[PDB]
């Protein structure tokens, strides 16, 4: 039934259709990512997914290209690494120098994957851009500057929230996902966007500055605020 495709060496009974992402993630190998999300929707922007197929003339988008038989995927192969280096050199080419004041800066995914990949030294020599702040709610402060044109948040917002106030604005340099007009975004699941932000762009106001992730214990249970349990 299932199509066969090779992870680096091992043959894999991968599902018909399905992305290279889920293929590598079946053997447990894990592709670097940002804009993609596991229960959202694929988007081609921010190509951190780049990998070369064994016979590939040039690298494919692992989070998106459907698997098919006869392919082989050396995730550890050098060219893929050059690709990821290509992503990280660029994301940081204009990122704000504010890890320390970032509420996400103690745990930002951009950091972990900055450690996993990208040259240790940078070669900036000019003047980075920085957008103005853009309030969209009392309980969800948005520093911006930090958002990486990754569009996971609009695909959350426009869809599951059902509200569409959020979205892209402009093109070329100084393009921004800052929502049009002053009006606040509002939703009954307004807060979840905070979680979904890869960086510190969407830091919650009430929790702001309060703490740093490593210090915290993570005691588990269930809420009773909803009957949803």
């Amino acid at each position: 039934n299932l199509i066969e495709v090779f992870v680096d060496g091992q043959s894999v009974m991968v599902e018909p259709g399905t992305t290279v992402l889920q293929a590598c993630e079946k053997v447990g190998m894990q592709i670097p990512r940002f804009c993609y999300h596991e229960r959202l929707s694929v988007a081609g922007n921010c190509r951190m997914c780049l990998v070369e197929i064994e016979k590939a003339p040039k690298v494919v988008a692992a989070c998106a290209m459907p698997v098919m038989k006869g392919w082989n995927i050396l995730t550890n192969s050098e060219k893929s690494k050059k690709a990821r280096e290509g992503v990280m050199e660029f994301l940081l080419a204009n990122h704000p120098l504010d890890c320390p004041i970032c509420d996400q800066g103690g745990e930002c995914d951009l950091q972990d994957q900055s450690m996993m990949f990208g040259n240790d030294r940078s070669r900036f020599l000019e003047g980075k851009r920085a957008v103005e702040d853009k309030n969209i709610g009392p309980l969800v402060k948005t520093i911006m500057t930090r958002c990486i044109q990754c569009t996971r948040c609009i695909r959350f917002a426009s869809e599951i929230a059902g509200v569409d106030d959020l979205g892209t604005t402009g093109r070329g340099n100084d393009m921004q996902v800052g929502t049009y007009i002053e009006k606040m975004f509002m939703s009954e699941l307004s807060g979840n966007i905070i979680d979904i932000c890869p960086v510190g762009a969407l830091t919650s106001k009430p929790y702001a500055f309060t703490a740093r992730p490593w210090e915290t214990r993570k005691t588990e249970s269930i809420d009773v605020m909803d009957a949803v349990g």
């Binding site: 599902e15 259709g17 889920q22 596991e38 229960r39 929707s41 459907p66 695909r155 869809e159």
Partner: protein
């Protein structure tokens, strides 16, 4: 802090392993299940199509 032992933490290769430790050591325990997320079918075009009412919008 009250209880001295409170910061203890212990990795295990398997569940029966941890159960075996709490049994060897005499403490009571509560087993909990693994939570691998269920697989989700996904495709680039699934976002589109006029009929499927996925559509999304501008991109």
């Amino acid at each position: 802090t009250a209880d001295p032992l409170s910061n203890m933490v212990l990795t295990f290769s398997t569940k029966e392993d941890a159960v075996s430790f709490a049994e060897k050591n005499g403490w009571s325990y509560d087993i909990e299940e693994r939570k691998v997320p269920k697989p989700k079918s996904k495709s680039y075009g699934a976002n589109f199509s006029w009929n499927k009412r996925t559509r999304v919008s501008t991109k």
